[PDB]
Design a protein around this ligand. Structure first.
Ligand code: CDL
Ligand code: 3PE
Ligand code: ZMP
Ligand code: SF4
Ligand code: SF4
Ligand code: SF4
Ligand code: SF4
Ligand code: FES
Ligand code: K
Ligand code: ZN
Lengths: 176, 95, 263, 208, 113, 48, 126, 360, 114, 96
């Protein structure tokens, strides 16, 4: 149930001693290492051509956040603050009130993307599939406050990415 | 259903707009105020009221497990339609 | 003294005659679960959540209503006490609406909390739930009567403390509903306190509606100044804004109630 | 209770109770409590004068041979007058077993350093100086190990706030990273999460 | 048979393990006789040292002595005998069979609080 | 597509030379991909 | 001997690294928290709590977040008794004030009192 | 040239992790463990999960245990690739770094297919794992495992018999067994000295009593035998991965206590009790019974343990994190005496040191 | 009331350790101003040393002043050995911090703090 | 895979291994990116009868630690467990 790495007593007959002396003087293992490096020289490299070729992902991927809507235009978020209660970094700030037709809707849904740890506890806490952590990872900014998302930015990300987000959820909701 | 303040600033679906004498409009100077122009309160009001023949209807939002939790809406009041508390879809007993 | 000796899980406790089973268990630091019992209202005994096994008795007793006899051993944590609690919680949650996200009582719900602590983790109810017509009792109490579990704390508060006699039960069986039966407006000076003692989110605060949520609120203990009663209150805030005002229990002032101006 | 319940290990529970009796009767001068949890771990709660006599014993007794110091810990419990609880976690590779030696101190009483028993402790209790302010007498090089060099206070005390009292920023006037009294653009939102209902009646404390 | 390596780094092979174990166990009993008889450390260590010394006196083979002392290699058995000797010499100076030096405070080990 | 390429080279995009008014001839951008092709290009699905 | 006698009052304010502003201007409050009247459970009224006086929370100009300058704003300490909390407040130099534990008084309950012959304590409904 | 004293000043990544754990629930404090030993993410997830489950008196289902052991050995491959290849990159062998980080990239694709994140998965949770394996994942783990032995073979072709690599590792950092036990070393740092100790054998957890593997034991205590032990632990990890792929059982992946593990979203949106349990597990969290455990696993750096103290609430009272790098870097000063300045980088290599778990 | 000491049996040995620590800081300050190349004077750094000693001059407990001497020796050891940078030495001099309002009236003007 | 046989033979000779049987670049052998929809099993607690929670309540079977000795014969010396059994050398590959 165990093995001894490096417990070989080397043979001391003239054959093996001459083999080790030929290895020392004629550099046989150094040529072995050069041969392995030469063997990688003629392999095809593993380099994809970004931006034109993209790394492989899956529908579970946790990227840029988005607020979703129903298939009627009504937003799914009903202000229950489960996402900001489960949020391990407290990135989500929510304020709510009843709007003009008496629905329970938010008036503040902030996600600080520079506190966010991108773990997706918010999208699994969410009982209506309102918040998701979508598929976008290419959203780097030149300014820090451009990563302080409000409700308008998250709803625009949902409107922007819904055609992909809905198909990823369609691929993955049976595991959830 | 966006509208505009007299300062030329868009008013959000919440109703947020800065005052004229508020300095914090300077953050949009040379840039843009990002609002979403699909107001959900105007979009759910475009949905037609569903006529049903029962007294209690169930609603899950459509999609089954992809919608909201399935709730049960009573429809005894004929003065008012019965609204889903999650999705806002409204129902009427046709009798 | 004429104190009788009873036993809560074998622990001897000396109680006054007339003490219920629930109070005798309170005296050893155990809290029997309850929905219709309230220590400032009359005993109802109609939610059956407080059913507890007295040993050598082949029937659980409603601990909120049953007085202790001398020599009882109240088994607060025996197997059939727990089976009684899970069965009664299953019937309370059978017709209850899946409204916990859109409900103001969420996070501070007795039904949620002692569903977690005393009932089963899942459902066997494969049927359709009832849906109760809402009522309009004023601008202070939002009324969503599908969430009602028929504990009648409405009616005992309005009859016994507010002294109003406008709330009641109409109908019979599973179709029994709580309300005024007419379009009548429950506006007492103590009308908002029915928001406090409703264990579910069937009666909620219409001004406070949807704005906050109990875990994120900070609880500052403070004094009412709307009158010279000096009611003890909790100003619950959230991020530097006053969210609502609850009562504090003070036995000598405001026992656990506040007025509607205070609230 | 087959599928979802953790199966109880009664053999290890019996063996750890017997070895706890063994330690409690070999060392009555220092051992205050001996307990075994329901998940079968042995805690030996001792007096702080016997850090070196107990831990040497467990390191050197032929029926103990706790040759490994896994972890050394302090726990701040402010309602205790000896608010710091020093926790040694020991591993016997010979007897394939773990023991826990717990003791106590407050801010002013020094604990004797266990570096002469286990050299492993040399940084660990040094961390206990840095995080808690528990002083260890006869330590070789006792100083801070994890906090910044000008740090005031001991962070893992529970009366110490989550953010500090100072925060750093670069200041272009003095051309220097500077420390200033902390201001947060968003305050840490305290959540009161505890349910008002009792969860575990086996752990119910008796009333006053 | 002259074991070539113990396998453990820094733990050299003992040439005469039985004589070393006999000297260490009798020296442990010599040190351990200076402890009072009501001290449980004396009784337990005399008991296990007599068991180990009887097993050493009843087995000529090194391998079988390793299998029935049940402590791995014979050199770490020798090291544990030396550790027990050093422990007994320290336990004389500590005197830890005495009563408890001080009671804990009343809620010192009460968890939870 | 080229399914003879190894997994990562087997799907690619040649970006447009003009998108939303910007001259993207040399300034190609990874966020120029619309979301309906973003599943296929990032191999979230087999289906274009 | 190996023990010294210190008759002085216990004070560790110079050792805890706390700035003086958050020692001599803060008012610790030692209290058992009141039961939330939304609920009937009493498991939060079991322990003593030390909180502090709330300081200024203001609006963040960028996001509207609640910005604070109070380090002791989220500091709630838990104690088993009142005297432990008082000893811990005095040990750290915090000027404190103590509210007493308010228990609910023993009520007199009777289900038969709902149906009296002559008393006002009859129920008119059930 | 000689090193007389080595004084490692640390705390440059002390982020106050385990004070931040004290204000967060058990689910909320799980993703701090992804970031301590941040090349060994799901192993630290497993150690914290086993600590919480030991305090909760519940156990994961068998398929969860097999998934945890499968991804623990994938994680062990990740960490030993990082360890061997950066230990060679610091010495100067920069090429097997690049050769092995493609296999490393494919295992990060395995993490991303099973959780959605390439590194910090938050996938192993108290109660089991968060989500089941997607269809087709185990076939690709088989296609990886079928080829990874040749990658180890060409790594070992570059470094092992190379005389320059042996001159940088053969008499360097020699630790005796008694000093390695006394300094609190664990893992390869013990087993390089000949100490026959692996926690997956001696104090076994989830299904390691049901997988069959060997334990590489060194004989000289040097950097070279610790290198060979990590290469052979990659070999034996491939062996465990094959046994996990063949013996993966059916069944659920969370514990079926909905007061601990959250229910499925299909029954959360249908059943009242499941919605209540979903609500309370994602806002309050489950309550852990009061007690203090010390739960330790054989992480690829050594004994990784948690001393976890619950007071009854849904948040930990205390969470001490025992990491191997703390004791190993405390032993750095002994291991570098009588050596040279370019030997200290080999000693900081052979102690697999990641300062997230050193400084917390 | 009978407690275990740290180094000092009473306040005399304790004041002796305080006095030796002040001697060591007074000797160290010119080397600190030189090798950190501070922009202060030796008089100013020695006044900061005297300020940090006279801040804690109200303490009457031997164990507390033992721990204060221990922490002062740790500060000095981190200053003699160049473990602090210039920033850590200059954090004693709150240079970028605006002066706080000291009287009642300006504290009333600027905000709510007592 | 697209390498010619001369470069393939050179590459296999220089590595000393057959590099086409085990390519480190992935091809059509890997799984499809679109899969059939799963159907996950439910646990043992998905029963409509004999499924009371108190008969499977793990968290409420945890007891406080049994206090073995508190300070308010010729009995055998004990160890915390039996001594560890010596590990057996591998039959698979002992390197011996
Ligand atoms: C020795 C000198 C070089 C001789 C040419 C050579 O060996 O070509 C590689 C050629 C193909 O090697 P391979 O890696 O097995 O091919 C796989 C390709 O991916 C399969 O080929 P492919 O499908 O990728 O074909 C596309 C490729 C076609 O490949 C070429 O054009 C090969 C390069 C020719 C130069 O064309 C390009 O990629 C465009 C490259 C344009 C620039 C080439 C370099 C110019 C250097 C001088 C300026 O090698 C051989 O056929 C064996 C060596 C023959 C030597 C004969 C004596 C001279
Ligand atoms: C009076 C008029 C003249 C005034 C003085 C000018 C002197 C000559 C300077 C060179 C010509 C000016 C233009 C310089 C390049 C500007 C255009 C440019 O950068 O186009 C972008 C294009 C590549 O596009 P990009 O977006 O970078 O690629 C993304 C990847 N697809 O980029 C390319 O396609 C490559 C651009 C190459 C730049 C020119 C070649 C290198 C410099 C040669 C001259 C200097 C050599 C000095 C000696 C060097 C050492 C030997
Ligand atoms: C560059 C900046 C350098 C910063 C240096 C920081 C070092 C700070 C070290 C602080 C150590 C102390 O404060 S120990 C002082 C505590 N002593 C006491 O409380 C006892 C009272 N002590 C005194 O009154 C002292 O003035 C004397 C000198 C001991 C006696 O004076 P009185 O007599 O008249
Ligand atoms: S992904 Fe995690 S850290 Fe980010 S907002 Fe969601 S819950 Fe918070
Ligand atoms: S995003 Fe979801 S979890 Fe968050 S408040 Fe909205 S509905 Fe609730
Ligand atoms: S009353 Fe309670 S159980 Fe019912 S929906 Fe509201 S929070 Fe949920
Ligand atoms: S509305 Fe509330 S208080 Fe009134 S009977 Fe129903 S559950 Fe009870
Ligand atoms: S509480 Fe006794 S039955 Fe309702
Ligand atoms: K209510
Ligand atoms: Zn709906």
């Amino acid at each position: 149930t165990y093995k001894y790495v490096n417990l070989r007593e080397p043979s001391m007959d003239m054959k093996s001693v001459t083999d080790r002396a030929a290895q020392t003087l004629l550099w046989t293992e150094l040529i072995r290492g050069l041969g392995m490096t030469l063997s990688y020289l003629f392999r095809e490299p593993a380099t994809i051509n970004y931006p034109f070729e993209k790394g492989p992902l899956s529908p579970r991927f946790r990227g840029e956040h988005a607020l979703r809507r129903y298939p009627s235009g009504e937003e799914r978020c009903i202000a229950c603050k489960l996402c900001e209660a489960v949020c391990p970094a407290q990135a989500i700030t929510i304020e709510a009130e009843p709007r003009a037709d008496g629905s329970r809707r938010t008036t503040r849904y902030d996600i600080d993307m520079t506190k966010c740890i991108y773990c997706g506890f918010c999208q699994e806490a969410c009982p209506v599939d309102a918040i998701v952590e979508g598929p976008n990872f290419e959203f780097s900014t030149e300014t820090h406050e451009e990563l302080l998302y409000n409700k308008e930015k998250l709803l625009n990300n949902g409107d922007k990415w819904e055609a992909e987000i809905a198909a990823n959820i369609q691929a993955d909701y049976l595991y959830r | 259903g966006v509208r505009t303040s007299p300062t030329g600033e868009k008013v959000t679906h919440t109703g947020q707009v800065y005052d004229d004498e508020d300095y914090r409009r300077v953050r949009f100077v040379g840039r843009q105020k990002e609002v979403n122009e699909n107001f959900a309160i105007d979009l759910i009001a475009e949905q037609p009221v569903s006529q049903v023949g029962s007294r209690v209807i169930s609603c899950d939002g459509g999609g089954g497990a992809l919608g909201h939790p399935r709730v049960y809406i009573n429809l005894d009041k004929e003065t008012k339609t019965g609204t889903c508390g999650y999705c806002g879809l409204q129902f009427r007993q046709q009798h | 003294s004429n104190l009788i000796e009873v036993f809560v899980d074998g622990q001897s406790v000396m109680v006054e005659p007339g003490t219920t089973v629930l109070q005798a268990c309170e005296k050893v630091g155990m809290q029997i679960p309850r929905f219709c019992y309230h220590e400032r209202l009359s005993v109802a005994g109609n939610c059956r959540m407080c059913l507890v096994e007295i040993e050598k008795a082949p029937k659980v007793v409603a601990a909120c209503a049953m007085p202790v006899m001398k020599g009882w051993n109240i088994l607060t944590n025996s197997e059939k006490t727990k089976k009684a609690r899970e069965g009664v919680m299953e019937f309370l949650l059978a017709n209850h609406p899946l409204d916990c996200p859109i409900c103001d009582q969420g996070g501070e719900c007795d039904l949620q909390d002692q569903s977690m602590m005393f009932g089963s983790d899942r459902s066997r109810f494969l049927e359709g739930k009832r849906a109760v017509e809402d009522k309009n009792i004023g601008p202070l109490v939002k009324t969503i009567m599908t969430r009602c579990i028929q504990c009648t704390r409405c009616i005992r508060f309005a009859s016994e403390i507010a002294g109003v006699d406008d709330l009641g039960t109409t109908g019979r069986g599973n179709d029994m509903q709580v309300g005024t039966y007419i379009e009548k407006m429950f506006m007492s000076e103590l009308s908002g306190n029915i928001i406090d003692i409703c264990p579910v989110g069937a009666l909620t605060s219409k001004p406070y509606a949807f704005t906050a949520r109990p875990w994120e609120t900070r609880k500052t203990e403070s004094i009412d100044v709307m009158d010279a009663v000096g009611s003890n209150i909790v100003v619950s805030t959230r991020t530097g804004e006053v969210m609502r005002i609850l009562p504090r229990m003070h036995e000598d002032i405001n026992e656990e109630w506040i007025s509607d101006k205070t609230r | 209770t087959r599928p979802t319940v953790r199966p109880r290990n009664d053999v290890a529970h019996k063996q750890l109770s017997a070895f706890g009796e063994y330690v409690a009767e070999i060392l009555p001068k220092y051992v205050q409590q001996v307990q075994v949890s329901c998940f079968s771990e042995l805690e030996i709660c001792i007096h702080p004068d016997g850090v070196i006599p107990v831990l040497t014993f467990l390191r050197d007794h032929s029926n103990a041979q706790f040759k490994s110091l896994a972890d050394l810990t302090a726990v701040d419990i402010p309602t205790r007058q000896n608010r710091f609880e020093i926790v040694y976690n020991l591993l016997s590779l010979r007897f394939n077993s773990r023991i826990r030696v717990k003791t106590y101190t407050d801010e002013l009483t020094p604990v004797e350093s266990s570096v002469s028993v286990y050299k492993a402790a040399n940084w660990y209790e040094r961390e206990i100086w840095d995080m808690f302010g528990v002083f260890f007498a006869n330590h070789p090089d006792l100083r801070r190990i994890l906090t910044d060099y000008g740090f005031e206070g001991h962070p893992f005390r529970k009366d110490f706030p989550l953010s500090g009292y100072v925060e750093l920023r670069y200041d272009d006037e003095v051309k220097r990273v500077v420390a200033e009294p902390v201001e947060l653009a968003q305050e840490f939102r305290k959540f009161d999460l505890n349910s008002p209902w009792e969860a575990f009646p086996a752990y119910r404390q008796p009333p006053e | 048979l002259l074991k070539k390596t113990t396998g453990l780094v820094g733990l050299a092979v003992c040439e005469t393990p039985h004589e070393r174990l006999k000297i260490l166990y009798t020296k442990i009993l010599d040190v351990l006789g200076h402890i009072p008889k009501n001290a449980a450390y004396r009784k337990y260590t005399e008991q296990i040292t007599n068991e180990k010394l009887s097993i050493v006196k009843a087995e000529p083979d090194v391998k079988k002595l390793e299998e029935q002392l049940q402590g791995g290699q014979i050199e770490e058995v020798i090291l544990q005998a030396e550790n027990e000797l050093s422990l007994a010499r320290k336990m004389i100076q500590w005197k830890p069979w005495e009563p408890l030096v001080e009671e804990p405070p009343a809620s010192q080990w009460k968890w939870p609080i | 597509e080229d399914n003879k390429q190894f997994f990562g080279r087997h799907r690619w995009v040649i970006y447009t030379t003009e998108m939303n008014g910007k001259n993207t001839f040399w300034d190609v951008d990874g966020s120029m991909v619309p979301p309906e092709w973003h599943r296929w290009l990032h191999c979230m699905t087999d289906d274009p | 001997t190996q023990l010294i006698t210190v008759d002085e009052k216990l004070d560790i304010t110079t050792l805890t690294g706390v700035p003086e502003e958050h020692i001599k201007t803060r008012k610790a409050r030692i209290f058992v928290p009141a039961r939330n009247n939304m609920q009937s459970g009493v498991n939060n009224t079991k322990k003593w709590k030390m909180e502090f006086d709330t300081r200024e929370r203001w609006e963040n100009p960028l996001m509207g977040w609640a910005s604070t300058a109070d380090p002791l704003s989220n500091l709630v300490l838990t104690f088993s008794t009142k005297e432990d909390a008082i000893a811990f407040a005095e040990k750290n130099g915090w000027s404190y004030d103590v509210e007493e534990r308010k228990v609910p008084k023993p009520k007199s309950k009777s289900y038969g009192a709902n149906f009296s012959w002559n008393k006002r304590t009859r129920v008119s409904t059930k | 040239e000689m090193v007389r004293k080595c004084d490692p000043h640390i705390g440059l990544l002390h982020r106050g992790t385990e004070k931040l754990i004290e204000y967060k629930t058990y689910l909320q404090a799980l993703p701090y463990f992804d970031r301590l030993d941040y090349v060994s993410m799901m192993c630290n997830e497993q150690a914290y999960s086993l600590a919480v489950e030991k305090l909760l008196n519940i156990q994961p289902p068998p398929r969860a245990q097999w998934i945890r052991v499968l991804f623990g050995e994938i994680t062990r491959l990740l960490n030993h690739i990082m360890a061997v290849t950066t230990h060679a990159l610091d010495i100067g062998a920069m090429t097997p770094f690049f050769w092995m980080f493609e296999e490393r990239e494919k295992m990060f694709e395995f993490y991303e297919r099973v959780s959605g994140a390439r590194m910090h998965a938050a996938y192993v949770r108290p109660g089991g794992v968060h989500q089941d394996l997607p269809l087709g994942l185990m076939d690709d783990i088989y296609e990886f495992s079928k080829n990874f032995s040749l990658r180890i073979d060409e790594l070992e072709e570059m470094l092992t018999n190379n005389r320059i690599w042996r001159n940088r590792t053969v008499d360097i950092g020699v630790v005796t067994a008694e000093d390695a036990l006394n300094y609190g070393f664990s893992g390869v740092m013990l087993r390089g000295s000949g100490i026959q100790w692996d926690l997956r054998k001696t104090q076994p957890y989830d299904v390691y009593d049901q997988v069959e593997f060997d334990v590489p034991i060194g004989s000289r205590g040097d950097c070279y035998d610790r290198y060979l032990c990590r290469v052979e632990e990659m070999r034996q990890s491939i062996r465990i991965i094959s046994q996990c792929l063949n013996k993966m059982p059916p069944g659920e992946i969370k514990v079926d206590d909905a007061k601990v593990s959250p229910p499925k979203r299909a029954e959360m949106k249908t059943s009242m009790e499941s919605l209540i349990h979903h609500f309370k597990l994602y806002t309050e969290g489950y309550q852990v019974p009061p007690g203090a455990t010390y739960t330790a696993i054989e992480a690829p750096k050594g004994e990784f343990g948690v001393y976890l103290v619950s007071d009854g609430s849904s948040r930990p009272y205390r969470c001490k994190i025992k990491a191997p790098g703390f004791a190993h870097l405390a032993g750095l000063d002994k291991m570098s005496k009588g050596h040279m300045l370019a030997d200290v980088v080999a000693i900081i290599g052979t102690q697999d040191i990641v300062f997230g778990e050193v400084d917390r | 009331t009978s407690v275990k000491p740290i180094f000092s049996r009473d306040m005399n040995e304790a004041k002796r350790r305080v006095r030796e620590l002040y001697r060591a800081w007074y000797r160290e300050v010119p080397n600190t101003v030189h090798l950190f190349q501070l922009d202060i004077s030796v008089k100013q750094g020695r006044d900061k040393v005297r300020e940090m000693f006279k801040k804690n001059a109200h303490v009457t407990d031997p164990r507390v002043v033992d721990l204060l001497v221990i922490k002062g020796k740790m500060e000095l050891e981190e200053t003699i050995n160049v473990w602090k940078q210039r920033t850590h030495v200059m954090r004693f001099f709150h240079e970028t911090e605006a002066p706080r309002p000291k009287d009642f009236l300006s504290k009333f003007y600027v905000g709510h703090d007592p | 895979a697209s390498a010619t046989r001369l470069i393939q033979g050179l590459r296999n000779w220089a590595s000393g291994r057959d590099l086409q049987a085990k390519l480190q670049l992935r091809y059509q052998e890997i799984s499809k990116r679109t899969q059939p929809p799963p159907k996950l099993p439910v646990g043992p607690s998905h029963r409509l009868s004999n499924n009371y929670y108190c008969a499977r309540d793990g968290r409420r079977e945890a007891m406080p630690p049994s206090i073995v000795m508190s300070s308010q014969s010729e009995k055998k010396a004990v160890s915390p467990a039996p001594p560890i059994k010596r590990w057996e050398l591998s039959q698979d590959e002992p390197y011996l």
